[PDB]
């Protein structure tokens, strides 16, 4: 048992000396509403066009083949529906061990922009009773939140020299503490931050281009929605991507941000602001003074209008 425990210590240390893989058991959650091409773009991130579209807890996998060490893991996909009677399928999706192995994606439909924030705080409330019911010990939960505050302040927007190699959001000058993005803290900032990588995806942003002409909106319409989105995602510590499902706008950008948030890789694109249906809002980049920078652009409106009335919901 000298040689047996010796040889077992040898078999523990030899597989340590091999090439590292991406750690499997990663889960990806899809929160949000149906009718938004969840299955469509989620197969696009898999590598397909459309899958066998079921309902409830749809499963796929994303083909995460490494380009560096040339390995391949596949992470789990849990497409949850718009239904809150089949919302109880999430215990097969994510547990507390794999809650740090989780990149949560929220669907915002930009085909139905008027139903966004009630679905956001409703599915976020679903996620809050979910995250209360899955029962993390609070010291590790607060450890996740304090280190998420830490990597939230670690972030920089990438430059042109950060579109290749990884942007060193940790120590560039080694062994110290310096500010990179210092957020003005409000009640819209991190008050139900959950210590996990959270994302909201605006889906079908080419259906904004219906409502730029068939509803004839202005620039301050999207800043109203976008400032409400900044206020709510910053409250949970999240990023925000403005995507078209149908035209498949910048899929590689999405895939680089997924492997960047899950396995600590690099997302090699700066925060796009230039096209209004393609404004990239990262995590750890925007703050409440940047919300007020949209209010400098508020010329004809004040932000206390109703959500479905300023952003005009048709009664069907």
């Amino acid at each position: 048992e000298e040689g047996q425990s010796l040889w077992s210590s040898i078999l523990s240390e030899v597989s340590t000396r091999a090439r590292s893989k991406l750690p499997s058991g990663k889960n990806i959650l899809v929160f949000g509403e149906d009718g938004s091409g969840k299955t469509t773009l989620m197969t696009k991130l898999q590598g397909a066009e459309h899958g066998k579209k079921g309902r409830g807890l749809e499963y796929l996998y994303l083909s995460v083949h490494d380009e560096d060490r040339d390995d391949h893991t596949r992470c789990n996909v849990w497409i949850l529906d718009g239904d809150l009677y089949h919302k109880g399928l999430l215990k097969f999706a994510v547990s507390a061990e794999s809650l740090p192995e989780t990149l949560v994606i929220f669907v915002a439909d930009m085909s139905r922009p008027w139903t966004v924030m009630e679905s956001l705080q409703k599915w976020a409330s679903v996620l809050r009773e979910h995250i209360d019911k899955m029962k993390i010990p609070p010291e590790k939960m607060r450890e996740l939140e304090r280190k998420f505050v830490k990597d939230f302040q670690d972030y920089m927007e990438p430059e042109e020299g950060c579109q290749g190699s990884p942007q060193r959001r940790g120590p560039l000058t080694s062994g110290s503490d310096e500010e990179n993005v210092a957020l003005p803290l409000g009640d819209n900032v991190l008050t139900h931050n959950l210590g996990i990588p959270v994302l909201v995806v605006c889906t079908k942003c080419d259906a904004v281009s219906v409502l730029e002409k068939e509803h004839d909106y202005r620039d301050e319409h999207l800043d109203f929605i976008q400032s409400h989105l900044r206020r709510f995602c910053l409250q949970y510590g999240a990023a925000l991507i403005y995507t078209s499902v149908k035209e498949e706008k910048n899929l590689d950008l999405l895939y680089k941000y997924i492997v960047h948030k899950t396995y600590g890789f690099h997302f090699t694109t700066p925060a796009l602001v230039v096209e209004k249906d393609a404004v990239f809002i990262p995590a750890g980049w925007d703050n409440e003074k940047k919300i007020a920078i949209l209010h400098e652009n508020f010329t004809t409106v004040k932000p206390e209008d109703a959500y479905e009335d300023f952003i005009v919901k048709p009664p069907v």
Binding site: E2, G3, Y59, N76, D83, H86, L89
Partner: protein, 146 residues
């Protein structure tokens, strides 16, 4: 040592006969409650064309969907346990001889007992089963056992 098709595709396959076995029922069309008119021959959803709200009209609650999905997670867990029986033994193909040989030194009884262990473990690895089945779900591992 590697599994092709992997555990994610195995879960995806069990969810595929979920999808075919549920679109026995769901891909049945539902009937417009008036037909000879005009306005429902205008654009309809899947909930207006097909009987897919009968899955939302589960009368005993949703309970058998989590029972089936827990059976899927249990089967995926057991075949995941047996595939990480044989993915433990990738250490022999990660094996550098210096980590054995600098550990052993020149004490001969360690070498003799190690040859006893490689004989005993080769006795275990020459067993009769090449394919393991749980329910319907089958591992092939005979080629890699050879």
């Amino acid at each position: 040592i590697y599994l092709n098709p992997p555990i994610e595709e195995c879960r995806y396959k069990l969810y595929q006969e979920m999808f075919a076995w549920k679109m026995v029922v769901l891909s049945l069309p539902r009937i417009q409650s008036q037909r000879y008119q005009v306005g429902v021959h205008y654009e309809l959803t899947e909930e207006e064309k097909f009987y897919r709200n009968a899955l939302t009209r589960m009368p005993d609650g949703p309970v058998a969907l989590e029972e089936s999905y827990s059976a899927v997670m249990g089967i995926v867990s057991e075949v995941e346990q047996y595939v990480k029986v044989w993915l433990q033994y990738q250490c022999l193909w990660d094996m550098q001889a210096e980590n054995i040989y600098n550990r052993l030194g020149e004490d001969l009884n360690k070498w003799q007992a190690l040859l006893v262990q490689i004989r005993k473990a080769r006795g275990t690895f020459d067993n009769a089963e090449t394919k393991k089945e749980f329910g319907p779900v089958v591992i092939d591992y005979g080629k890699v056992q050879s």
